[PDB]
Design a protein around this ligand. Sequence first.
Ligand code: CLA
Ligand code: CLA
Ligand code: CLA
Ligand code: CLA
Ligand SMILES: C=Cc1c(C)c2cc3nc(c4c5[nH]c(cc6nc(cc1[nH]2)C(C)=C6CC)c(C)c5C(=O)[C@@H]4C(=O)OC)[C@@H](CCC(=O)OC/C=C(\C)CCC[C@H](C)CCC[C@H](C)CCCC(C)C)[C@@H]3C
Ligand SMILES: CC(C)=CCC/C(C)=C/CC/C(C)=C/CC/C(C)=C/CC/C(C)=C/CC/C(C)=C/CC/C(C)=C/CC/C(C)=C/CC/C(C)=C/CC1=CC(=O)C(C)=C(C)C1=O
Ligand SMILES: CCCCCCCCCCCCCCCC(=O)OC[C@H](COP(=O)(O)OC[C@@H](O)CO)OC(=O)CCCCCCCCCCCCCCC
Ligand SMILES: CC1=C(/C=C/C(C)=C/C=C/C(C)=C/C=C/C=C(C)/C=C/C=C(C)/C=C/C2=C(C)CCCC2(C)C)C(C)(C)CCC1
Ligand SMILES: CC1=C(/C=C/C(C)=C\C=C/C(C)=C/C=C/C=C(C)/C=C/C=C(C)/C=C/C2=C(C)CCCC2(C)C)C(C)(C)CCC1
Ligand SMILES: [Fe+2]
Ligand code: NA
Lengths: 27, 38, 38, 484, 32, 32, 30, 30, 67, 30, 76, 348, 36, 31
Amino acid sequence: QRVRTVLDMDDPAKEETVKELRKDINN
Amino acid sequence: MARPNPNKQVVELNRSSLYWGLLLIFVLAVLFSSYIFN
Amino acid sequence: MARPNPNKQVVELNRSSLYWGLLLIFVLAVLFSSYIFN
Amino acid sequence: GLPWYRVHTVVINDPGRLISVHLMHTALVAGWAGAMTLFEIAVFDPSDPVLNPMWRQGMFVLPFLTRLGVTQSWGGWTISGETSSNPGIWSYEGAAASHIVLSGLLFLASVWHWVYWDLELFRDPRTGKTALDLPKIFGIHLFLAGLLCFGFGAFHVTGVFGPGIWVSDPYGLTGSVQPVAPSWGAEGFDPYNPGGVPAHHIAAGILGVLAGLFHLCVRPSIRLYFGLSMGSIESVLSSSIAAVFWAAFVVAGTMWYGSAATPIELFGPTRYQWDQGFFQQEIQKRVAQSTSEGLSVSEAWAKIPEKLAFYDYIGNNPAKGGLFRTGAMNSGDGIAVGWLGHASFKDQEGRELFVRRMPTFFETFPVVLIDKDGVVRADVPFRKAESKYSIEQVGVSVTFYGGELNGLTFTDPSTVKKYARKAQLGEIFEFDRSTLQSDGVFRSSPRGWFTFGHLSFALLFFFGHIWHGSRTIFRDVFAGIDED
Amino acid sequence: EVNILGLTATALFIIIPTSFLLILYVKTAASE
Amino acid sequence: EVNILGLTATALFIIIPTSFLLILYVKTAASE
Amino acid sequence: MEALVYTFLLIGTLGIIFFSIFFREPPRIA
Amino acid sequence: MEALVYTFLLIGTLGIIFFSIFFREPPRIA
Amino acid sequence: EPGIVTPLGTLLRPLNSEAGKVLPGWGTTVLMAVAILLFAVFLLIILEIYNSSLILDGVTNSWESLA
Amino acid sequence: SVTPSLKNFLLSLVAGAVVLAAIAGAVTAV
Amino acid sequence: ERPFSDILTSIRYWVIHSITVPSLFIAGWLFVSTGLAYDVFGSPRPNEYFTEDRQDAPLITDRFNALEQVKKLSAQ
Amino acid sequence: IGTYQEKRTWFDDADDWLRQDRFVFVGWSGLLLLPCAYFAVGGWLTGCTFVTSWYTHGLASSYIEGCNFLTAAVSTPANSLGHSLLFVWGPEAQGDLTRWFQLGGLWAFVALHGAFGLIGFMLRQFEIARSVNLRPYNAIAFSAPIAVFVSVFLIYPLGQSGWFFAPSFGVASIFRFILFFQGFHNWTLNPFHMMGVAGVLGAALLCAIHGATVENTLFEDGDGANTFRAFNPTQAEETYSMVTANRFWSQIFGVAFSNKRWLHFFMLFVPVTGLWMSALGVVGLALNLRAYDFVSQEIRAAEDPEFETFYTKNILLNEGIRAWMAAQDQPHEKLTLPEEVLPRGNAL
Amino acid sequence: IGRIPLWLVGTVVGLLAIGLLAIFFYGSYVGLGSSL
Amino acid sequence: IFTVRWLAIHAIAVPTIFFLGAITAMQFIQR
Ligand code: CLA
Ligand code: CLA
Ligand code: CLA
Ligand code: CLA
Ligand SMILES: C=Cc1c(C)c2cc3nc(c4c5[nH]c(cc6nc(cc1[nH]2)C(C)=C6CC)c(C)c5C(=O)[C@@H]4C(=O)OC)[C@@H](CCC(=O)OC/C=C(\C)CCC[C@H](C)CCC[C@H](C)CCCC(C)C)[C@@H]3C
Ligand SMILES: CC(C)=CCC/C(C)=C/CC/C(C)=C/CC/C(C)=C/CC/C(C)=C/CC/C(C)=C/CC/C(C)=C/CC/C(C)=C/CC/C(C)=C/CC1=CC(=O)C(C)=C(C)C1=O
Ligand SMILES: CCCCCCCCCCCCCCCC(=O)OC[C@H](COP(=O)(O)OC[C@@H](O)CO)OC(=O)CCCCCCCCCCCCCCC
Ligand SMILES: CC1=C(/C=C/C(C)=C/C=C/C(C)=C/C=C/C=C(C)/C=C/C=C(C)/C=C/C2=C(C)CCCC2(C)C)C(C)(C)CCC1
Ligand SMILES: CC1=C(/C=C/C(C)=C\C=C/C(C)=C/C=C/C=C(C)/C=C/C=C(C)/C=C/C2=C(C)CCCC2(C)C)C(C)(C)CCC1
Ligand SMILES: [Fe+2]
Ligand code: NA
């Protein structure tokens, strides 16, 4: 549900996640 | 008696002996494989 | 083109080639046995 | 005499003996297929389809058997865990026995073609010498290949007569062999679209039939005949080796990167699936969607399937084994028997930490537990003398919310360090290391072994194609110039 | 599974005497 | 407790090509 | 394998006796 | 065995090079 | 020197009865080159689709493609 | 529709054809 | 045949090279000194490595919007 | 084509123009070799001079920033780009040249053009050997550098996460790649790499021995103190004493060459075989299939606190390479590691 | 043809190349890359 | 002239001279 949170949930474990790599311009 | 060996002989194995040897080897394997695998 | 085959050839392997083959086989075994046994 | 590396050149100007040695090779390959299938059936354990699948057991030819339709065996089991219906003659062991019988028949045909090599069919009618009409042979073979491709794509994979192919969940949870409707749009060129394989095989079969008819009806030009040496069997050898190593590079690439023809449930997960957080992202999205609908986070994790958590584990990474770490994946780190759960870590004051996962390149990785923002907040230190992040003083406790460990909160830092070290590998799983006397180091997947073998074979056959192209372009100087 | 000791013993007991007999037959038939 | 799979692999990789090369050398030297 | 070795040995023996029957050396001297 | 195989392979290689040095074919044509 | 005359061989004899027969000039080499160029363009199309260098409306190039 | 990546790919095909034509012109010259 | 042992000795080669080689050298010198090399090949000036928003090593961290992101985090 | 009429077309005229002896040979292969090689060398010399590496790797790899010839390089793209071909017209560059640079597009340009230039160069060797009616053993020998280039700059990054892990075109970049293979791959322990090392060392061995032997058994063929004027290509006699060379190396080394064919074929064989084995090893490393460990040694060291070897020392050094290199080596991997978790010994 | 000596041309070109290499080595101690 | 030799040696020589002038200019660039 929370797209903002799940990104911050799994990126500390793994920063090469697809959702972190895509649309990283807006971050 | 000279440079070559006078006792030089060759081994002869015809097709009947080849068949007998192959049959003996395979039949021995058939008989004993059941006991080797156990 | 007849009952015998004109394409029949024999294989020649002199002592230099035998030594090279044995050396290659044993050196490959020396190199790779440490990894096969691991 | 002949050198040891030339003993097969005797069958160059001998089509009958060339057919005989082709039949010998074909018999050896079919016999290997049958024997390998029976070995894998003998060493296969079908007890746990979810947590001990075939790719965890080092199964090489069983994924390829399964991919085209056979699923149940003569032992009454099925790899999907379903109840076995009548397998018919085409089970795993049935296909293996058919391959062995075919190998024996090809062996007998090879013996016959070795003895009877002077057939008039191999003789030129107007010159009397021995010759092969290679363009016409190519036309016939291309027509047969087009017919086979069209039949395999129109009847087998579409399920109008055959069983279909294996299609699955994108996350590899639910999958089976079923018919696939062809996709004639641009989506048919989508590599992961299963519908693009029947559309391919139909269209390529039709085009191959048309091209075979064209080669049957139309002779080549004289300039092209002399340029490519179409009267030489060495030239077609070089061209065939070129096409074959092209196809080997293609299959190695598709196996490594994953495709619709390379299912996860059959060949294991992908190193890019591990690197890109595919299963991890899906698991976290499922947990977030469950907990956003008013669900406690001990039972939102219990809704997570056993198979998905097993997929989210670096020990299943194909790019994690070794060149001489031989054998099954189970023989490396035990047979998985259960999911311990999702290790959630908290500090003394209370905030969620996340263990930084091991990347694919690393044989070893320092154990750190960082914050949601991205700041290192704890770790398992090396020096332990000036430690300002060690768990013993930070106060990191693990909670767990899964199968065997659902509410067991461990505040013992000695166990917390061990659980963090298990958490950097992905989802923590319980393993049995005494059944197979397991090693400890991770092994490679059949996907990785296939890719390595075929890439090595592809480079070797690139060299072979270069050598044979040299031998056929330079045939006169490889024979002699006679002082001119 | 797999009795690899029995497999090795059976395979060697098949391969070694069969190859020995085949080599003898080939060298006998080559030189009449 | 003996890595006999590695022993079998090493022994076969030694025996088979050495015997093959020795047989070729013997049949080459027998008929000049 | 267990049954595969037995099947292979049995069909090898059958192939040997088949070759002995049909592809034998032709009999000479009586 | 572990070290016995390594010793066997090393002394086999040494015996091969010894035979190559001493019991080689005599060098013909230059 | 009559060879070995066999029934299946004399059945399949016409398919091996015109070895060495060629066409004068360059033949259909122009059409062959056109087909090769079209094959190269198509191979580049599928290579760039699979490389995600050619984004298409219906192609996603991911495992969700088989969702 | 026509994706910008597809339009760029077709323009690249046209540019490659132009480059090959220029190479052919240069080798028919000199 | 002009085996290069007569072209270099001739002054006809050097009357057309006494201005051509220095002209190319000066062209490269002005290409560097005018900032055109930085402008064309995208290399930053020594004062344009770290902007105000970021003081660390930049990361592309995007593929399909890499042009937009490099436009955002390059020198304005 | 068998004394046929062979009516002349455009192909015959272009054929006659291309296979003509000039200052530089062009041929049909020159339609690919000359532009591809020229663009590859020009792209490398441009990236080493003007194109920065600040955006992709976060470093300086050009002469315009303060790097040497041993220091500047054409750097690979970012791992975020993956295995993207990075065309100037592609969805990433989007027709922009100055931003097709500083994104790693020039690395892909140089790599693809170098691969096709190598293809064109072996085609050129084939064509020249066919023109002079000689066997293409030069092309057969050149198959091994092309195999090394393919397996290293294409197959290994294609098996890894992306072109970022490919070797950047340079000197210090290649040394980075080499130390990366030492720390992360244990490439020295790989038997295929050992075979490649043996091939190259034995090839240099053969080159030095053959040159020294030929130049030391030269005969007189003249009266002056300089033997180089003594060589005359018109005479059909051999310029050096094969019998004397064979006896010298037979009494020095134990074995010696007796066939010039076998000697020169061995000189051909050793480096090609070595580079092909090293190529197969890099293919193995493309999928992280490594000869990294010896399981018996690891188990014995785990259960034995006083057993160590140079192998264990090598593994301890590889761990240090990985941990101390990854943080500043892979910026996409974002290692904010403290220096109190990194493996550090005593004092040093 | 032969108006100026080939050895003189080679000497002048060598002087220019040595000067270029010397100024390249000098530029490693000043400006960018000088580590100061 | 403008033959294949001329085009080849000029495609080698002109950018090398331009780049050598560029590098000599860059030797005097200071921060
Ligand atoms: C390209 C084809 C291919 C591929 C991809 C695989 C892949 C696989 N096989 Mg298989 N196999 C194959 C062909 C193949 N096989 C063939 C042709 C045979 C018949 C001989 C077998 C027989 C076989 C058996 C009996 C078993 C496997 C097993 C396995 C799995 C375990 C990993 C492994 O292979 O160990 C490691 C692989 C290597 C170490 C490769 C060696 C690397 C090079 C080639 C070594 C060089 C040799 C050297 C020059 C010689 C000197 C060594 C000497 C000193 C001994 C794996 C998925 C095992 C399994 O999991 O059970 C199902 C199993 O027990 N295979
Ligand atoms: C009656 C014939 C027959 C049938 C029905 C089968 C059926 C099967 N075989 Mg098989 N096989 C056969 C003959 C047959 N085989 C013969 C004669 C040989 C000896 C050469 C083999 C050797 C063999 C091996 C080694 C293996 C099998 C395997 C298999 C199983 C899986 C096949 C698969 O998925 O791989 C996929 C098949 C392919 C990818 C083939 C693709 C063909 C390429 C792409 C052609 C491209 C070039 C072409 C000329 C281009 C044409 C141009 C176009 C325009 C028309 C399957 C049950 C596998 C197995 O699991 O063991 C049991 C396996 O490993 N077989
Ligand atoms: C289907 C592909 C194919 C085919 C039909 C051929 C056929 C032939 N090759 Mg060739 N070649 C190939 C691929 C192929 N090659 C590849 C991929 C390479 C690169 C490694 C080469 C490199 C090569 C060279 C350098 C030479 C040939 C030569 C020859 C000719 C005689 C050699 C021979 O067989 O004697 C007998 C061969 C042996 C006894 C091999 C020894 C055993 C090897 C080393 C290991 C055993 C392999 C194992 C049992 C099964 C592996 C197969 C599988 C893994 C693919 C023959 C017509 C020779 C030639 O040009 O003729 C004048 C020659 O010198 N080939
Ligand atoms: C002629 C030699 C040659 C060769 C072999 C190459 C090869 C290559 N170049 Mg390159 N290039 C060249 C010259 C060449 N180039 C020149 C002279 C320039 C300066 C303008 C460039 C500038 C350049 C750039 C800027 C880039 C490349 C790139 C590339 C690579 C990918 C190109 C691609 O994917 O598009 C495919 C090309 C084709 C498919 C060729 C088109 C052939 C068409 C289909 C022929 C159809 C004509 C037909 C008969 C018309 C009649 C029909 C009509 C009557 C209806 C590739 C390996 C890219 C790269 O390196 O990737 C990083 C890239 O960025 N090149
Ligand atoms: C680092 C080692 C190395 C280098 C630099 C090298 C270089 C060369 N080898 C050649 C030939 C050969 N190499 C051979 C065997 C070998 N060569 C070896 C190792 C090397 N060979 C080894 C080990 C072997 C034994 C197997 C043979 C048998 C030949 C030849 O026939 C040929 C020759 O005549 O020898 C003098 C030359 C012709 C190349 C050419 O014009 O390609 C044309 C294509 C070009 C120029 C484009 C390719 C560009 C490359 C691949 C990618 C781009 C790289 C940048 C341009 C530069 C980057 C530089 C940094 C990395 C420092 C070239 C000078
Ligand atoms: C207790 C014990 C024993 C301790 C030992 C422990 C231990 C460390 C063992 C060593 C292990 C070992 C064997 C390591 C090697 C493993 C390894 C890396 C194997 C590589 C195997 C392999 C197949 C590699 C492929 C690459 C390749 C083909 C390399 C081959 C290298 C090779 C044979 C090079 C040639 C060597 C050499 C001496 C050249 C001969 C030169 C020669 C005598 C020329 C003389 C000569 C010159 C002339 O010019 C003329 C005119 C004449 C007339 C003439 O004569
Ligand atoms: C005090 C003396 C010091 C020298 C002692 C040490 C020298 C050892 C002898 C070299 C090895 C013999 C090679 C056999 C192979 C052999 O003798 O073949 C014989 C061959 C002679 O070739 P021909 O000239 O006869 O070739 C034409 C033939 O085709 C026709 O007959 O020798 C050579 O190839 C030249 C020398 C190569 C020698 C390469 C050295 C290989 C290194 C081996 C290392 C072993 C591993 C390490 C040990 C564990
Ligand atoms: C006659 C007959 C029959 C049949 C029989 C049989 C039983 C057969 C078989 C067979 C078989 C059962 C086969 C198998 C096989 C195997 C193979 C053929 C293999 C192999 C090998 C290889 C090729 C390898 C390679 C390699 C090496 C060298 C090492 C490792 C790695 C690698 C892979 C690289 C019957 C009675 C039914 C009926 C009819 C008649
Ligand atoms: C990029 C690119 C491109 C390409 C281009 C080209 C192809 C060109 C070039 C170029 C070049 C090609 C340049 C160069 C450079 C060079 C240099 C910079 C040099 C040098 C230096 C030095 C230092 C030297 C030294 C020496 C030696 C070593 C030898 C002798 C002596 C002397 C001393 C002289 C284009 C635009 C298409 C587009 C895409 C991308
Ligand atoms: Fe020489
Ligand atoms: Na220390």
